[PDB]
Amino acid sequence: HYEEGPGKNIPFSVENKWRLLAMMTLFFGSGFAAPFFIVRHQLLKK
Amino acid sequence: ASGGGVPTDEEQATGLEREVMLAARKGQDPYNILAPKATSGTKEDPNLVPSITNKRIVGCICEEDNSTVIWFWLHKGEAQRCPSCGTHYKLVPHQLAH
Amino acid sequence: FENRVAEKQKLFQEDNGLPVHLKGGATDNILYRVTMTLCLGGTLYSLYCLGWASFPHK
Amino acid sequence: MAYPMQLGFQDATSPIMEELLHFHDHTLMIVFLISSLVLYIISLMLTTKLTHTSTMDAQEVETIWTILPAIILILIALPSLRILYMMDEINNPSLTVKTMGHQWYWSYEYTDYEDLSFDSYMIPTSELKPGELRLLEVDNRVVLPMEMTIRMLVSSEDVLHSWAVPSLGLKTDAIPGRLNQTTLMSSRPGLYYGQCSEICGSNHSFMPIVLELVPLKYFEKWSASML
Amino acid sequence: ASAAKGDHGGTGARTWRFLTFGLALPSVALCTLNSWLHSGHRERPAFIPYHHLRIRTKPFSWGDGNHTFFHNPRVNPLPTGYEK
Amino acid sequence: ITAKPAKTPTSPKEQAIGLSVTFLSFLLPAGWVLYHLDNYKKS
Amino acid sequence: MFINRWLFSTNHKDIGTLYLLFGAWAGMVGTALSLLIRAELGQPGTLLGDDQIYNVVVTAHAFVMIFFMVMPIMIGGFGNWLVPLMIGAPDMAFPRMNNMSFWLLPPSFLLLLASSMVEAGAGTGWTVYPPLAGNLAHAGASVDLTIFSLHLAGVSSILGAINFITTIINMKPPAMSQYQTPLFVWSVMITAVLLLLSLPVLAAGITMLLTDRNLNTTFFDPAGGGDPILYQHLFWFFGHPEVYILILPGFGMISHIVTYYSGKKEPFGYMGMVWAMMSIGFLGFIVWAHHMFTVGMDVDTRAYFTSATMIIAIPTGVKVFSWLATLHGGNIKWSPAMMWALGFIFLFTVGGLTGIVLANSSLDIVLHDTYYVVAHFHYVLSMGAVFAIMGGFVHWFPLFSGYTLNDTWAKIHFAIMFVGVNMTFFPQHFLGLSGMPRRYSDYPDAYTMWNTISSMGSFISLTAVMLMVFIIWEAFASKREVLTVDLTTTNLEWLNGCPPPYHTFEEPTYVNLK
Amino acid sequence: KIKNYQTAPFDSRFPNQNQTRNCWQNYLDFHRCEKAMTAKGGDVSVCEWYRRVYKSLCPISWVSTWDDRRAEGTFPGKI
Amino acid sequence: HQTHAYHMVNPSPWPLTGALSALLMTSGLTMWFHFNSMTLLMIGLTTNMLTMYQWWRDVIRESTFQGHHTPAVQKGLRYGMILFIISEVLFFTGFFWAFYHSSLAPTPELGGCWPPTGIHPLNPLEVPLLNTSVLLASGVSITWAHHSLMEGDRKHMLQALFITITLGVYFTLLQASEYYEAPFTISDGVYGSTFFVATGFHGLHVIIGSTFLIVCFFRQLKFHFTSNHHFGFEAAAWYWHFVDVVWLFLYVSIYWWGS
Numbered sequence A: 001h002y003e004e005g006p007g008k009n010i011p012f013s014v015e016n017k018w019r020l021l022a023m024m025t026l027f028f029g030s031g032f033a034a035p036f037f038i039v040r041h042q043l044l045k046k
Numbered sequence B: 001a002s003g004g005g006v007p008t009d010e011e012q013a014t015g016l017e018r019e020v021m022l023a024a025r026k027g028q029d030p031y032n033i034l035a036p037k038a039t040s041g042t043k044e045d046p047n048l049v050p051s052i053t054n055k056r057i058v059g060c061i062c063e064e065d066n067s068t069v070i071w072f073w074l075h076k077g078e079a080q081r082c083p084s085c086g087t088h089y090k091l092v093p094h095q096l097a098h
Numbered sequence C: 001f002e003n004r005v006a007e008k009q010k011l012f013q014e015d016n017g018l019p020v021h022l023k024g025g026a027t028d029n030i031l032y033r034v035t036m037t038l039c040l041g042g043t044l045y046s047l048y049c050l051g052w053a054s055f056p057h058k
Numbered sequence D: 001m002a003y004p005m006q007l008g009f010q011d012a013t014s015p016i017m018e019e020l021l022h023f024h025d026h027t028l029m030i031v032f033l034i035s036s037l038v039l040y041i042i043s044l045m046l047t048t049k050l051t052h053t054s055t056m057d058a059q060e061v062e063t064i065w066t067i068l069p070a071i072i073l074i075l076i077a078l079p080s081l082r083i084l085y086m087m088d089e090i091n092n093p094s095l096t097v098k099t100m101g102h103q104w105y106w107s108y109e110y111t112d113y114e115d116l117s118f119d120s121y122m123i124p125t126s127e128l129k130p131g132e133l134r135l136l137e138v139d140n141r142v143v144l145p146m147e148m149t150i151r152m153l154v155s156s157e158d159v160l161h162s163w164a165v166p167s168l169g170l171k172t173d174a175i176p177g178r179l180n181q182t183t184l185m186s187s188r189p190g191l192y193y194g195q196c197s198e199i200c201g202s203n204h205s206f207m208p209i210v211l212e213l214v215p216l217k218y219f220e221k222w223s224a225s226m227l
Numbered sequence E: 001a002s003a004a005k006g007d008h009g010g011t012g013a014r015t016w017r018f019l020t021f022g023l024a025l026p027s028v029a030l031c032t033l034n035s036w037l038h039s040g041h042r043e044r045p046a047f048i049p050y051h052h053l054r055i056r057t058k059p060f061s062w063g064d065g066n067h068t069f070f071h072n073p074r075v076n077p078l079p080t081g082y083e084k
Numbered sequence F: 001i002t003a004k005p006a007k008t009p010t011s012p013k014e015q016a017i018g019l020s021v022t023f024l025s026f027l028l029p030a031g032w033v034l035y036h037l038d039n040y041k042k043s
Numbered sequence G: 001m002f003i004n005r006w007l008f009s010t011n012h013k014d015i016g017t018l019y020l021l022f023g024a025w026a027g028m029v030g031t032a033l034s035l036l037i038r039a040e041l042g043q044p045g046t047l048l049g050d051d052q053i054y055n056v057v058v059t060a061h062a063f064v065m066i067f068f069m070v071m072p073i074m075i076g077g078f079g080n081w082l083v084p085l086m087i088g089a090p091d092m093a094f095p096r097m098n099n100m101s102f103w104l105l106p107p108s109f110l111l112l113l114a115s116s117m118v119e120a121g122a123g124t125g126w127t128v129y130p131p132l133a134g135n136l137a138h139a140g141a142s143v144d145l146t147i148f149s150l151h152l153a154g155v156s157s158i159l160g161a162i163n164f165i166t167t168i169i170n171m172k173p174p175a176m177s178q179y180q181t182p183l184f185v186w187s188v189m190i191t192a193v194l195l196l197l198s199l200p201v202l203a204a205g206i207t208m209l210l211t212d213r214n215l216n217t218t219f220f221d222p223a224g225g226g227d228p229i230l231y232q233h234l235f236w237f238f239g240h241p242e243v244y245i246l247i248l249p250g251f252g253m254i255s256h257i258v259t260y261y262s263g264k265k266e267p268f269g270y271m272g273m274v275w276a277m278m279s280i281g282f283l284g285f286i287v288w289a290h291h292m293f294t295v296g297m298d299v300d301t302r303a304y305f306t307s308a309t310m311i312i313a314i315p316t317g318v319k320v321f322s323w324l325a326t327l328h329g330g331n332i333k334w335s336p337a338m339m340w341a342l343g344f345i346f347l348f349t350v351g352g353l354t355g356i357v358l359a360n361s362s363l364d365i366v367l368h369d370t371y372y373v374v375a376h377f378h379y380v381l382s383m384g385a386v387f388a389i390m391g392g393f394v395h396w397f398p399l400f401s402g403y404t405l406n407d408t409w410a411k412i413h414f415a416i417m418f419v420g421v422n423m424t425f426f427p428q429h430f431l432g433l434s435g436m437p438r439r440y441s442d443y444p445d446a447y448t449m450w451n452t453i454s455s456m457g458s459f460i461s462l463t464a465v466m467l468m469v470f471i472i473w474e475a476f477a478s479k480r481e482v483l484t485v486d487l488t489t490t491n492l493e494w495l496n497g498c499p500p501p502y503h504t505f506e507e508p509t510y511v512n513l514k
Numbered sequence H: 001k002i003k004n005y006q007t008a009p010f011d012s013r014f015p016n017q018n019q020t021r022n023c024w025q026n027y028l029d030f031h032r033c034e035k036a037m038t039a040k041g042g043d044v045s046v047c048e049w050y051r052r053v054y055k056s057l058c059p060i061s062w063v064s065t066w067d068d069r070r071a072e073g074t075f076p077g078k079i
Numbered sequence I: 001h002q003t004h005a006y007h008m009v010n011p012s013p014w015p016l017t018g019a020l021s022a023l024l025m026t027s028g029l030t031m032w033f034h035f036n037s038m039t040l041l042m043i044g045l046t047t048n049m050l051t052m053y054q055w056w057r058d059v060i061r062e063s064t065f066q067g068h069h070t071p072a073v074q075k076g077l078r079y080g081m082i083l084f085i086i087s088e089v090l091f092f093t094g095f096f097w098a099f100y101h102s103s104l105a106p107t108p109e110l111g112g113c114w115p116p117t118g119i120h121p122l123n124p125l126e127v128p129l130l131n132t133s134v135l136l137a138s139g140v141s142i143t144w145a146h147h148s149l150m151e152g153d154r155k156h157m158l159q160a161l162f163i164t165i166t167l168g169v170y171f172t173l174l175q176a177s178e179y180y181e182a183p184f185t186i187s188d189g190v191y192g193s194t195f196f197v198a199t200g201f202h203g204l205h206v207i208i209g210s211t212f213l214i215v216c217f218f219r220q221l222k223f224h225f226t227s228n229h230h231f232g233f234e235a236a237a238w239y240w241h242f243v244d245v246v247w248l249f250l251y252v253s254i255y256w257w258g259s
């Protein structure tokens, strides 16, 4: 069966807080950055 | 105008469907399909709560029509009382599948 | 025709730990792999198309 | 037009717009009262160490907080509907002017007697004359006679647009294939501004409306000269 | 309503088969008779290039982009009129 | 609610690092695009 | 094992978790788009120098916040996690179909991002009105990709609604009547009913737009005898129920939070709360044309929609006053969640009241398509929904994860956000009354002050969002495991521990019929 | 004669905001009258009122498009 | 071990393959409508058929073969199907609204009349009437099929179900012929728009309904259904009645009143 309990019922690991910081940073950061880059994409097409 | 060839539940039901069907025939409710009827809930006449383990969550509707349900774990051992109305409940553990 | 439901019930209730989508046998595995390959490949192809359509061809 | 740091509505240019100002004052009072009362009660419930956590009976206070709101709604609805129907009253205009929305300008047609029509484009910021308003000035204004009931017919020749003049309390969507009617009546002479009020693409922010209200005599000579 | 028949003392398989063969299918047979009688190709009307018809705001994603999906040369004219 | 002490405490120094990294992950990319806006507009 | 668990899930908790993750990510996308909006309006002139891009940004912002952030979080996240637990059910009725409701969202989101990448994007407004959205004014794939994104999100929500309604109706303990289920469960069921009835109408309407754009139909094209106003009717017939769909689960969570932190065993006037939500749901289907007061409607029709719309204030008032009556006499626990709930009550009331101002067609002629409308919905919808989501998130985070947040940091986050949203939106009332149109990339000079302040407030909220991410990180980084939770006798979802095991209620609860 | 027209008066048959039919009706009436008059041998000046009303209400592009269609034989209305 | 009667489903790949096939079909339609290619669409349609096949195959395995459909599970499936049908009714409602909006206030472009100038409607007394008797009749035969199953009569269940399906196929063939014979097209203004899109979606539903009945036919041949447990057949029948009622409204509205 699957692991259960705190830190085990999630699709990401919280074993190391710094690797976690990196993960959360890429996750939330990629979401927040996308519109800026889409605008940039549209400005550079013409 | 008429004939047969269609199986019946008695001949073809299987798995859990068959279990519920055969148990219902003996008047039993191992899969909790029915709402149990309350006893007087006194110390001498507590509500008997079946369980296959040593604790079961009980939900007490203190008075008829109450919209608030009082929930608590009932453990094996001495009868416990509803935190709200004090009616008694006692766990009666194990079995189900022979 | 004859009723072979009981045979199928035995096959699908066999204690082999297989999930229902694979419990029928080797064919289930093939069909699943075909399905998932077409889905994943088609998705990669769609991303490719998006990349292509994202830019002007004047 | 709006001025710097404006809080409320533009001053009323027509009697209907004045009517709306008084109705908004009435409604806003109610909005202030109810929101302040709610804030107050939140603070009242949160500022005492006294408690009562047992079951509380509801079918009594629910009457009050059901009947009161109902009365307040009728107190808002009455003057609201009076104005709605008042706007709708038959008024019989002295003039009919049509306006067609286009992808990025308005055209006007005064075809009661002569076949007068022209385009009205926003004056680019680079071409504004000293003292003129950025994004609001047009090359050709909608000259109209003051103190007269005018029928405005609105439509479009492409996408949706919306013809608006806040000071007069007007906003009528410009829909292709449809001819929407509204009546205009200015109590004073002057210049009255509005802006396209339905997203129509790239230059939705740049196709304003400017009405120039003058005495009938000047309106007639202007029509003549515009043929 | 109640129809004009009767039974109702017990609606079972026999009753529904009776309705299938005694009412339903005979109705289908009659309508099939009436239809495959009133058919016969109607003389197609003169072509008039009305602007509210034969709409083309974007070519169709098939054929030459000017023919509807179930185009029938006999009765469906193109924006320029009937075909050869 | 009651809970037990942190199994892996995050000191003030560690929190300053997490907070800074977090703020930077949002601000840098957006800042970069916005800074180069004129470079995109006409190019 | 990872793929089996996270890609092939049939578990309500794991699926609710995927939804919360998806919604949080979408919230980041939606926030960035909103900052781009406010940056363009931060000072007079043009920033992007491309108004079609600005329009595409406004459009995407709305779709993302509504379809990818709010609905997924409230219904897919909190709904999947809490509904089965609150009724003692082993899972949802259709646990496998439930997984597809989730998996349809990433593709739907990809289609939305694709529409903004190809051609010049769909700069239509989230209402997607033709002819602007037609194949002449918006030629190319963009609008078609937007329509398809909505189709996928629509199927996801319709199947989800069927699942929730069936689960809530069919899977309660034998002895529990519908009048013994918690208010959140009621809020989700009513929301599901609105979704079931309204989304198919939107699907019909956008399918008609799709055929007008690609199959030469003319449902909304006057040249073929069509009517652009028909689309508006079909859209708003779905649109108004949708705004209530966005707030109902919020009302549900607010009822639990307020009851919980008031130290109460139950909300004041339970049946009145049930009645209020049902009435709001019902009335929400007969008021749609208040979004069309300037299209040229008959005066009697306008008088009817003005009246019907106002009536919704009565049932809504019963809820507001009941929340206050729940606080009355309570042993108030000033937790971060309670703060979000109190902020909700006040901010929602403000927005609701400006909605009542707008209900009056006479005034709406002047306020329609101006910033007064934008101010109205950012209070009821933006603050209302976001404050309910934050309150529920901080309140149930320990249940979902098994860890506690730092209460001080969470109170700081609330404070910043409260200042930010009010500085951003309150000035917009002034801009609206004075005539500034919505959907504008620039404005006449007189409007400069309020737009400047509004854009500054938008940065304050950005600071709150970044802090929120850090706070979540800190919780997961410190690992303070939960021990005890108060009031579990009237909050069943907490009774199986934090986090509850994969399979809960394998042995159902025992509830007497008496 | 009997004229002295300023603009099209209120018409109880078209009392609402959508005036499309009012314009259309008066355009049809003018051309139906004009046809009957030029046909049976009479004066088009009796059709004047309709001409004035439709001219006042109808967008130039509509009148123009309808005129073009009557000429082409594609006018969908009955005249 | 569980002591409730509900079904905990094994982790399944179908929800994902189904979602991806949705992406492929929508992407596919876009590629077809704009970048003149049917490659994505073809893959999408294929994975969609494969997903439905395997997903419903498994539901049969879980019920007929494993016995997971206890009365509580079957009760939920009943609610699920009723709710599904309700959402379909609302979908069609949008098309009827579109039809009535256009026909009740014909615009000047149509000649200010309905049907529009230049449109020559089909005679509702000809094939449209035949189609009506065909669906009404299949409603009678499927009811006979249902009673035969409940009464344990295999042969007559199969006979009645076969007749129902043949009638559904007859309707489809007749409709296809009507489509080809119609002098008006989908591009003929709002008349052709409302006609083809509404009857077109209905036709799709008739095909889906026929397919569902065919699935039941084969499951019956294989003895899956018992005289008392046969939800798949019941769902097929409810769906079939829905399709029948939608036709009656289309016939009355579009074909008869709209002519």
Ligand SMILES: CCCCCCCCCCCCCCCCCC(=O)OCC(COC(=O)CCCCCCCCCCCCCCCCC)OC(=O)CCCCCCCCCCCCCCCCC
Binding pocket: A009, A010, A011, A012, A013, A023, A024, A026, A027, A030, A034, G006, G017, G018, G020, G021, G022, G024, G025, G105, G106, G107, G109, G110, G113, G397, G400, G401, G472, G499
């Ligand atoms: C897009 C994803 C970014 C990629 C970054 C990941 C890098 C992996 C390297 C890889 C390095 C391997 C490390 C192994 C283990 C840990 C990392 C993990 O396994 O990797 C992946 C895991 C974990 O996710 C993470 O990685 C970190 C996330 C941390 C989240 C903290 C959330 C706190 C809030 C609380 C939420 C509720 C839970 C609380 C309660 C607790 C639960 C009960 O995700 C998932 O498998 C499921 C998530 C699915 C969907 C979410 C949003 C997607 C939107 C897509 C639409 C796109 C449209 C086109 C858009 C195209 C873009 C232009």
Ligand SMILES: CCCCCCCCCCCCCCCCCC(=O)OCC(COC(=O)CCCCCCCCCCCCCCCCC)OC(=O)CCCCCCCCCCCCCCCCC
Binding pocket: D007, D008, D009, D028, D031, D032, D035, D036, D039, G350, G354, G422, G423, G426, G427, G429, G430, G433
């Ligand atoms: C940041 C914005 C700065 C604005 C400064 C104004 C400049 C004054 C020049 C000083 C110049 C004075 C001379 C001007 C007179 C012209 C009168 C008129 O023709 O114009 C009429 C206009 C103008 O409005 C006014 O007649 C002034 C009202 C001002 C209300 C200010 C509330 C401030 C709260 C603090 C921050 C906001 C966020 C709180 C949220 C409040 C909820 C709405 O009316 C409106 O439609 C605006 C508001 C509309 C809708 C909101 C309804 C709910 C209010 C809730 C009250 C909560 C109280 C608790 C107390 C609140 C506790 C939080």
Ligand code: HEA
Binding pocket: D034, D038, D068, D069, D070, D072, D073, G243, G244, G246, G247, G290, G291, G309, G310, G312, G313, G314, G316, G317, G318, G320, G348, G349, G350, G351, G352, G353, G354, G355, G356, G358, G359, G360, G364, G367, G368, G369, G373, G376, G377, G380, G381, G382, G384, G385
């Ligand atoms: C959470 C989402 C949500 C909710 C709940 C509401 C609730 C309401 N909305 Fe709002 N609304 C939107 C989201 C929402 N709205 C959106 C997104 C738009 C614009 C969409 C777009 O164009 O893009 C919009 C647009 C909008 C319009 C159109 C404006 C225009 O475009 O010109 C109107 C018209 O009447 C309106 C009215 C109302 C009313 C009367 C309520 C009522 O339900 C509010 C009732 C609540 C209260 C009144 C407060 C609590 C009550 C009391 C304390 C009791 C006492 C009160 C009284 C006696 C008055 N809304």
Ligand code: HEA
Binding pocket: G020, G023, G024, G027, G028, G031, G034, G035, G037, G038, G058, G059, G061, G062, G065, G066, G069, G070, G073, G124, G125, G126, G127, G374, G378, G381, G382, G383, G385, G386, G389, G390, G393, G421, G424, G437, G438, G439, G440, G441, G458, G461, G462, G465
């Ligand atoms: C749910 C709906 C929602 C939300 C939250 C928001 C949030 C915001 N919106 Fe809104 N907006 C709309 C819906 C919403 N908006 C709609 C429907 C339109 C109309 C579009 C059109 O005209 O077509 C619009 C239009 C619109 C305009 C008008 C554009 C124009 O007319 O030109 C403006 C202008 O300032 C604006 C600003 C903002 C800002 C600054 C925020 C926010 O930054 C305010 C602060 C809120 C947040 C930062 C959200 C944080 C939430 C999360 C990150 C989730 C966290 C997740 C978990 C805890 C699980 N929005």
Ligand SMILES: CCCCC/C=C\C/C=C\C/C=C\C/C=C\CCCC(=O)O[C@H](COC(=O)CCCCCCCCCCCCCCCCC)COP(=O)(O)OCCN
Binding pocket: B001, B002, E021, E022, E023, E025, E026, E029, E032, I159, I163, I166, I167, I170
């Ligand atoms: C281009 C068209 C194509 C589309 C066709 C659509 C569906 C049709 C497909 C199959 C239908 C036909 C047969 C079905 C297959 C096997 C049938 C054999 C069973 C049988 O013989 O059934 C008999 C019924 O008669 C029967 O078929 C009788 C069946 C015939 C009924 C219709 C014929 C009409 C004849 C003229 C009468 C019309 C007059 C109208 C009067 C007014 C009505 C109210 C009853 O007998 P039994 O002894 O009680 O039964 C013992 C077990 N079978």
Ligand SMILES: CCCCC/C=C\C/C=C\C/C=C\C/C=C\CCCC(=O)O[C@H](COC(=O)CCCCCCCCCCCCCCCCC)COP(=O)(O)OCCN
Binding pocket: E068, E069, E070, E071, E072, E076, G151, G152, G154, G155, G203, G207, G210, G211, G215, I172, I175, I176, I179, I180, I181, I182, I183, I184, I185, I186, I187, I196, I197, I199, I200, I201, I203, I204
């Ligand atoms: C035989 C009776 C049964 C009808 C269906 C059978 C075959 C057609 C293929 C798919 C139909 C499925 C749904 C209907 C969608 C559009 C209307 C189709 C109805 C139809 O088939 O109409 C035909 C038009 O074909 C056209 O454009 C068809 C063009 C085909 C492209 C399909 C476009 C796909 C658009 C689908 C959008 C899907 C959105 C669904 C949303 C679901 C909810 C989320 C009519 O032909 P015609 O030549 O104009 O006139 C006849 C003159 N002799």
Ligand SMILES: CCCCC/C=C/C/C=C\CCCCCCCC(=O)O[C@H](COC(=O)CCCCCCCCCCCCCCC)COP(=O)(O)OCC[N+](C)(C)C
Binding pocket: D041, D055, D056, D057, D061, D064, D065, D068, D069, G321, G324, G325, G328
């Ligand atoms: C826009 C329009 C809306 C505006 C205003 C509406 C506000 C209403 C204002 C006042 C309401 C008056 C209700 C009167 C109830 C008396 C309170 C009381 O005292 O509460 C109980 C009554 O139960 C009960 O009604 C249950 C407890 C109290 C009942 C009512 C509680 C809620 C009151 C309102 C809460 C604040 C929210 C107001 C919203 C505006 C006490 O019970 P007993 O004395 O039997 O037992 C005590 C034992 N003895 C016998 C030894 C004394």
Ligand SMILES: CCCCCC/C=C\CCCCCCCCCC(=O)O[C@H](COC(=O)CCCCCCCCCCCCCCC)COP(=O)(O)OC[C@@H](O)CO
Binding pocket: G093, G094, G095, G096, G097, G098, G151, G152, G155, G158, G162, G200, G203, I007, I009, I018, I019, I021, I022, I025, I026, I048, I051, I052, I055, I056, I058, I059, I062, I063, I068, I073, I077, I080, I081, I084, I087, I088, I091
């Ligand atoms: C091209 C343009 C847009 C395209 C979008 C297409 C989107 C997805 C396409 C692929 C989906 C097909 C896959 C088959 C889905 C079967 C779902 C099903 O059959 O779900 C069932 C529940 O719904 C029930 O009953 C009753 C409900 C039956 C639901 C059938 C699903 C149809 C999906 C389309 C819905 C359209 C919405 C209609 C409104 C306009 C079974 O529930 P499970 O949890 O599985 O099992 C529970 C176990 O106890 C069973 O033993």
Ligand SMILES: CCCCCC/C=C\CCCCCCCCCC(=O)O[C@H](COC(=O)CCCCCCCCCCCCCCC)COP(=O)(O)OC[C@@H](O)CO
Binding pocket: G298, H016, H017, H018, H021, I089, I093, I097, I098, I100, I101, I102, I104, I105
């Ligand atoms: C049933 C509930 C109780 C009834 C109470 C009343 C509320 C709705 C009534 C439903 C039927 C009303 C039909 C009345 C026809 C009169 C109006 C009419 O004639 O409207 C027409 C369109 O109606 C149309 O499509 C009307 C088409 C539908 C619009 C109403 C929306 C409801 C549809 C969804 C309902 C879901 C229920 C599920 C069904 C099983 C055309 O447009 P007008 O604006 O008229 O243009 C004329 C102008 O030129 C003059 O200025």
Ligand SMILES: CCCCCC/C=C\CCCCCCCCCC(=O)O[C@H](COC(=O)CCCCCCCCCCCCCCC)COP(=O)(O)OC[C@@H](O)CO
Binding pocket: B012, B013, I052, I056, I057, I059, I060, I063, I064, I069, I077, I081, I207, I208, I209, I211, I212, I215, I224, I225, I226, I229, I230, I231, I232, I233, I235
């Ligand atoms: C060229 C043709 C391709 C066209 C695409 C669509 C193709 C086919 C759609 C037809 C759907 C077939 C569904 C077959 C379902 C088989 C599984 C089944 O029927 O499963 C049954 C449960 O019902 C269940 O899940 C009920 C499940 C309900 C599913 C019905 C949903 C219809 C799907 C519509 C999708 C499109 C939406 C419209 C688009 C606008 C199993 O229980 P029982 O029958 O009681 O058996 C148990 C007994 O044996 C015990 O003794």
Ligand SMILES: CCCCCCCCCCOC1OC(CO)[C@@H](O[C@H]2OC(CO)[C@@H](O)[C@H](O)[C@@H]2O)[C@@H](O)[C@H]1O
Binding pocket: F027, F028, F029, F030, F031, F032, F034, F035, G035, G036, G039
């Ligand atoms: C709405 C959300 C946005 C919030 C505002 C963003 C807050 C500030 C972000 C800082 O980010 C940056 O700062 C720069 C300037 O300080 C840049 O450097 C740039 O500028 C330089 C010097 O001025 C150079 O050293 C480099 O080449 C360079 O590209 C730029 O890349 C960027 O990452």
Ligand SMILES: C[C@H](CCC(=O)O)[C@H]1CC[C@H]2[C@@H]3[C@H](O)C[C@@H]4C[C@H](O)CC[C@]4(C)[C@H]3C[C@H](O)[C@]12C
Binding pocket: D059, D060, D062, D063, D064, D066, G271, G272, G275, G318
């Ligand atoms: C009768 C029903 C349920 C009562 C119960 O079974 O417990 C209750 C619940 C909510 C009540 C309604 C709400 O309290 C709101 C209204 C309050 C007014 O005092 C009377 C009518 C009013 C519309 C109420 C009528 C009726 O008493 C309702 C509808």
Ligand code: CUA
Binding pocket: D101, D102, D104, D160, D161, D162, D196, D197, D198, D199, D200, D201, D203, D204, D205, D207
């Ligand atoms: Cu024209 Cu906006």
Ligand SMILES: [Cu+2]
Binding pocket: G239, G240, G243, G287, G288, G290, G291
């Ligand atoms: Cu609304």
Ligand SMILES: [Mg+2]
Binding pocket: D162, D197, D198, G294, G368, G369
């Ligand atoms: Mg508008």
Ligand code: NA
Binding pocket: G040, G041, G042, G043, G044, G045, G046, G047, G441, G442, G443
């Ligand atoms: Na700007």
